[PDB]
């Protein structure tokens, strides 16, 4: 799969993260991110995708070594960590045909797994609107603990 790049934007308290809501297949909440173009450097793709989806330019704030990266179904997704962004920032997608809404969420309130359906003796996982974000939540919490504590 083609690698994706984006950002985990946190506010000044380190409590809240910025998620964006797409449409259809991307109908839930996730971190801003998208597919790398040919010959495009990871930091440039992250900044482009974030600016397209949020209207906020991270370019002056990217730290090269500060990211969480996951390989899901043999696609690589790397989110640069960008703390300290004020909660009163005006975010506006470029692209309202792609982005429904943009909100801050409390990190401690976000799920770090979906729930099973053990109550119903059925296999699988219950739907959760944070499905696209969830894989990153525990690594994010651990990364923040190590870096700040
Ligand atoms: C809406 C705007 C665009 C970013 C999008 N990010 C995303 N994270 N996982 C996926 C699935 C394709 C694998 O997409 C979700 C939020």
UniProtKB/Swiss-Prot annotation:
GO terms for molecular function: 5'-(N(7)-methylguanosine 5'-triphospho)-[mRNA] hydrolase activity; 5'-3' RNA exonuclease activity; manganese ion binding; RNA exonuclease activity, producing 5'-phosphomonoesters; telomerase RNA binding. Expressed in brain and testis. Not detected in heart (at protein level). Residues 1-131 form the Nudix hydrolase domain. It is found in: Cytoplasm, P-body; Nucleus. GO terms for cellular component: cell junction; cytoplasm; cytoplasmic ribonucleoprotein granule; cytosol; nucleoplasm; P-body; RISC complex. One of its GO terms (biological process) is nuclear-transcribed mRNA catabolic process, deadenylation-dependent decay. Changing residue 52 to Q: Loss of decapping activity. Mn(2+) binds at residues 49, 53. Phosphorylated at ser-249 in a MTOR-dependent manner. Transmembrane segments: none annotated. Its main location: cytoplasm. Keywords: Cytoplasm, Hydrolase, Manganese, Metal-binding, Nonsense-mediated mRNA decay, Nucleus, Phosphoprotein, RNA-binding. It comes from the Eukaryota. A motif (Nudix box) lies at residues 34-55. Belongs to the Nudix hydrolase family. DCP2 subfamily. Decapping metalloenzyme that catalyzes the cleavage of the cap structure on mRNAs. Removes the 7-methyl guanine cap structure from mRNA molecules, yielding a 5'-phosphorylated mRNA fragment and 7m-GDP. Necessary for the degradation of mRNAs, both in normal mRNA turnover and in nonsense-mediated mRNA decay. Plays a role in replication-dependent histone mRNA degradation. Has higher activity towards mRNAs that lack a poly(A) tail. Has no activity towards a cap structure lacking an RNA moiety. Found in a mRNA decay complex with LSM1, LSM3, LSM4, EXOSC2, EXOSC4, EXOSC10, PARN, XRN1, CNOT6, UPF1, UPF2 and UPF3B. Forms a complex with DCP1A, EDC3, DDX6 and EDC4/HEDLS, within this complex directly interacts with EDC4/HEDLS. Interacts with DPC1B. Interacts (via N-terminus and C-terminus) with TRIM21 (via N-terminus and C-terminus). Associates with polysomes. Interacts with LIMD1, WTIP and AJUBA. Interacts with DDX17 in an RNA-dependent manner. Interacts with ZC3HAV1. Interacts with APOBEC3G in an RNA-dependent manner. Interacts with ZFP36L1 (via N-terminus). Interacts with NBDY. This is m7GpppN-mRNA hydrolase. It comes from Homo sapiens (Human).
